[PDB]
Amino acid sequence: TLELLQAQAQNCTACRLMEGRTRVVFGEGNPDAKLMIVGEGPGEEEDKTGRPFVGKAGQLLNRILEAAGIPREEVYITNIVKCRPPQNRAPLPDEAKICTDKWLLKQIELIAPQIIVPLGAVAAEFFLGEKVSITKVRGKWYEWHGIKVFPMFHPAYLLRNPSRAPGSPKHLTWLDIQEVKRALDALP
Ligand code: SF4
Numbered sequence: 528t529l530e531l532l533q534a535q536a537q538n539c540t541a542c543r544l545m546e547g548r549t550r551v552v553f554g555e556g557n558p559d560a561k562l563m564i565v566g567e568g569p570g571e572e573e574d575k576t577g578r579p580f581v582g583k584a585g586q587l588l589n590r591i592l593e594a595a596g597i598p599r600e601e602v603y604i605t606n607i608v609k610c611r612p613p614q615n616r617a618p619l620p621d622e623a624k625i626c627t628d629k630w631l632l633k634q635i636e637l638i639a640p641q642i643i644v645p646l647g648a649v650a651a652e653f654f655l656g657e658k659v660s661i662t663k664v665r666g667k668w669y670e671w672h673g674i675k676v677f678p679m680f681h682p683a684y685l686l687r688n689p690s691r692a693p694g695s696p697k698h699l700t701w702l703d704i705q706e707v708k709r710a711l712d713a714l715p
Contacts (some may be wrong), residue, residue: 539609541629542625543621545610549611554603558638560638562603562640563603566607566645568606568612570582570683572585573611591701592704595708597707597711607631642714644678645676647661655676656671679703
Protein backbone atom coordinates (compact mmCIF):
# COMPACT_ATOMS: atom_id res chain seq x y z
CA THR A 528 0.00 0.00 0.00
CA LEU A 529 0.85 3.70 -0.11
CA GLU A 530 1.10 3.77 3.68
CA LEU A 531 3.59 0.90 3.87
CA LEU A 532 5.66 2.78 1.28
CA GLN A 533 5.34 5.97 3.37
CA ALA A 534 6.35 4.08 6.50
CA GLN A 535 9.38 2.50 4.83
CA ALA A 536 10.56 5.79 3.30
CA GLN A 537 11.12 7.23 6.78
CA ASN A 538 14.19 5.03 7.12
CA CYS A 539 15.58 5.62 3.61
CA THR A 540 19.31 6.32 3.28
CA ALA A 541 19.79 5.85 -0.48
CA CYS A 542 21.29 9.28 -1.25
CA ARG A 543 23.56 11.77 0.53
CA LEU A 544 20.58 14.00 1.33
CA MET A 545 19.93 11.75 4.32
CA GLU A 546 22.90 13.27 6.14
CA GLY A 547 21.42 16.70 6.79
CA ARG A 548 17.74 15.77 7.15
CA THR A 549 15.61 15.79 10.32
CA ARG A 550 12.50 14.20 8.88
CA VAL A 551 11.74 12.72 5.47
CA VAL A 552 8.88 14.50 3.69
CA PHE A 553 7.34 11.62 1.73
CA GLY A 554 3.98 13.24 0.92
CA GLU A 555 0.34 13.66 1.98
CA GLY A 556 -3.25 14.15 0.91
CA ASN A 557 -5.83 12.06 -0.93
CA PRO A 558 -4.47 8.52 -1.64
CA ASP A 559 -6.69 8.24 -4.72
CA ALA A 560 -6.25 11.83 -5.83
CA LYS A 561 -7.08 12.94 -9.36
CA LEU A 562 -4.55 15.77 -8.97
CA MET A 563 -0.97 15.28 -7.75
CA ILE A 564 1.34 18.23 -7.11
CA VAL A 565 5.10 17.72 -7.30
CA GLY A 566 7.68 20.29 -6.24
CA GLU A 567 11.50 20.40 -6.07
CA GLY A 568 12.33 19.42 -2.51
CA PRO A 569 11.39 20.31 1.10
CA GLY A 570 12.44 23.37 3.12
CA GLU A 571 12.98 24.45 6.76
CA GLU A 572 9.48 23.89 8.16
CA GLU A 573 8.98 20.84 5.93
CA ASP A 574 12.15 19.29 7.32
CA LYS A 575 10.96 19.98 10.85
CA THR A 576 7.38 18.72 10.55
CA GLY A 577 7.82 15.99 7.94
CA ARG A 578 4.87 17.50 6.05
CA PRO A 579 5.16 18.94 2.50
CA PHE A 580 4.49 22.63 1.80
CA VAL A 581 3.87 24.00 5.32
CA GLY A 582 6.29 26.93 5.37
CA LYS A 583 6.10 30.40 3.79
CA ALA A 584 5.80 29.06 0.21
CA GLY A 585 3.52 26.20 1.26
CA GLN A 586 1.15 28.74 2.80
CA LEU A 587 1.07 30.44 -0.59
CA LEU A 588 0.26 27.12 -2.30
CA ASN A 589 -2.71 26.77 0.09
CA ARG A 590 -3.96 30.22 -0.90
CA ILE A 591 -3.46 29.62 -4.63
CA LEU A 592 -5.36 26.33 -4.25
CA GLU A 593 -8.41 27.64 -2.40
CA ALA A 594 -8.52 30.60 -4.79
CA ALA A 595 -9.46 28.06 -7.46
CA GLY A 596 -11.90 26.08 -5.32
CA ILE A 597 -9.48 23.16 -4.91
CA PRO A 598 -9.43 21.67 -1.36
CA ARG A 599 -5.87 20.73 -0.32
CA GLU A 600 -6.98 17.48 1.39
CA GLU A 601 -8.38 16.13 -1.89
CA VAL A 602 -5.04 16.35 -3.70
CA TYR A 603 -1.70 14.63 -3.15
CA ILE A 604 1.45 16.67 -2.64
CA THR A 605 5.18 15.69 -2.77
CA ASN A 606 8.54 16.70 -4.27
CA ILE A 607 11.21 15.14 -6.50
CA VAL A 608 13.33 14.43 -3.41
CA LYS A 609 12.00 13.73 0.10
CA CYS A 610 14.90 15.00 2.22
CA ARG A 611 15.90 18.62 2.73
CA PRO A 612 19.08 19.30 0.72
CA PRO A 613 21.75 21.47 2.44
CA GLN A 614 20.78 25.18 2.60
CA ASN A 615 17.66 24.53 0.46
CA ARG A 616 19.68 24.00 -2.72
CA ALA A 617 18.01 22.15 -5.57
CA PRO A 618 18.66 18.40 -5.63
CA LEU A 619 21.52 17.07 -7.78
CA PRO A 620 20.54 14.78 -10.74
CA ASP A 621 22.26 12.11 -8.66
CA GLU A 622 19.86 12.14 -5.72
CA ALA A 623 16.97 13.08 -8.03
CA LYS A 624 17.29 9.82 -9.97
CA ILE A 625 17.64 7.62 -6.88
CA CYS A 626 14.80 9.13 -4.83
CA THR A 627 12.49 9.26 -7.80
CA ASP A 628 13.14 5.61 -8.75
CA LYS A 629 12.69 4.51 -5.14
CA TRP A 630 9.55 6.52 -4.31
CA LEU A 631 8.07 8.99 -6.79
CA LEU A 632 7.37 6.41 -9.52
CA LYS A 633 5.55 4.07 -7.12
CA GLN A 634 3.62 6.93 -5.54
CA ILE A 635 2.37 7.91 -8.99
CA GLU A 636 1.58 4.27 -9.80
CA LEU A 637 -0.42 3.72 -6.58
CA ILE A 638 -2.33 7.02 -6.65
CA ALA A 639 -2.99 7.00 -10.41
CA PRO A 640 -3.57 10.78 -10.76
CA GLN A 641 -5.16 12.09 -13.95
CA ILE A 642 -3.30 15.40 -13.79
CA ILE A 643 0.24 16.06 -12.53
CA VAL A 644 1.16 19.62 -11.68
CA PRO A 645 4.95 19.97 -11.41
CA LEU A 646 6.14 23.02 -9.43
CA GLY A 647 9.40 24.52 -10.66
CA ALA A 648 12.08 23.65 -13.22
CA VAL A 649 13.38 20.56 -11.39
CA ALA A 650 9.96 18.86 -11.26
CA ALA A 651 9.06 19.94 -14.80
CA GLU A 652 12.33 18.52 -16.12
CA PHE A 653 11.31 15.18 -14.68
CA PHE A 654 7.98 14.84 -16.51
CA LEU A 655 9.12 16.43 -19.77
CA GLY A 656 12.20 14.25 -20.03
CA GLU A 657 14.63 17.04 -20.90
CA LYS A 658 16.32 20.25 -19.73
CA VAL A 659 13.80 23.06 -19.74
CA SER A 660 12.94 26.65 -18.86
CA ILE A 661 10.13 26.97 -16.33
CA THR A 662 9.08 30.33 -17.82
CA LYS A 663 8.46 28.64 -21.18
CA VAL A 664 6.72 25.38 -20.21
CA ARG A 665 4.66 27.03 -17.48
CA GLY A 666 0.92 27.03 -18.22
CA LYS A 667 0.96 24.55 -21.11
CA TRP A 668 -0.37 20.99 -21.24
CA TYR A 669 1.97 18.06 -21.72
CA GLU A 670 1.81 14.29 -21.42
CA TRP A 671 3.78 11.68 -19.44
CA HIS A 672 2.86 7.96 -19.54
CA GLY A 673 -0.72 8.77 -20.47
CA ILE A 674 -1.18 11.39 -17.78
CA LYS A 675 -1.68 15.13 -18.29
CA VAL A 676 1.18 17.30 -17.02
CA PHE A 677 0.78 21.03 -16.37
CA PRO A 678 3.93 22.86 -15.21
CA MET A 679 3.63 25.94 -12.99
CA PHE A 680 5.87 28.36 -11.15
CA HIS A 681 6.90 27.19 -7.71
CA PRO A 682 5.38 29.27 -4.83
CA ALA A 683 8.91 30.15 -3.63
CA TYR A 684 9.55 31.75 -7.01
CA LEU A 685 6.53 33.99 -6.36
CA LEU A 686 7.98 35.10 -3.01
CA ARG A 687 11.24 36.00 -4.79
CA ASN A 688 9.30 37.95 -7.45
CA PRO A 689 6.27 39.31 -5.47
CA SER A 690 5.12 41.72 -8.22
CA ARG A 691 1.32 42.12 -8.53
CA ALA A 692 1.67 43.69 -12.01
CA PRO A 693 -0.16 42.19 -15.01
CA GLY A 694 1.71 39.27 -16.58
CA SER A 695 3.74 38.83 -13.40
CA PRO A 696 4.46 35.31 -12.05
CA LYS A 697 1.72 35.78 -9.43
CA HIS A 698 -0.83 36.87 -12.04
CA LEU A 699 0.12 34.04 -14.40
CA THR A 700 -0.06 31.52 -11.53
CA TRP A 701 -3.60 32.64 -10.71
CA LEU A 702 -4.59 32.06 -14.35
CA ASP A 703 -2.84 28.66 -14.39
CA ILE A 704 -4.61 27.31 -11.30
CA GLN A 705 -7.98 28.25 -12.84
CA GLU A 706 -6.91 26.29 -15.93
CA VAL A 707 -6.15 23.29 -13.69
CA LYS A 708 -9.60 23.67 -12.12
CA ARG A 709 -11.39 23.68 -15.49
CA ALA A 710 -9.36 20.63 -16.54
CA LEU A 711 -10.19 18.78 -13.30
CA ASP A 712 -13.94 19.38 -13.69
CA ALA A 713 -13.81 17.94 -17.21
CA LEU A 714 -12.39 14.54 -16.22
CA PRO A 715 -14.11 11.15 -16.83
S1 SF4 B 1 15.99 12.19 -0.70
FE1 SF4 B 1 14.89 10.29 -1.23
S2 SF4 B 1 16.51 8.83 -1.85
FE2 SF4 B 1 17.53 10.55 -0.77
S3 SF4 B 1 17.69 9.83 1.35
FE3 SF4 B 1 15.76 11.01 1.21
S4 SF4 B 1 14.18 9.50 0.75
FE4 SF4 B 1 16.17 8.50 0.32
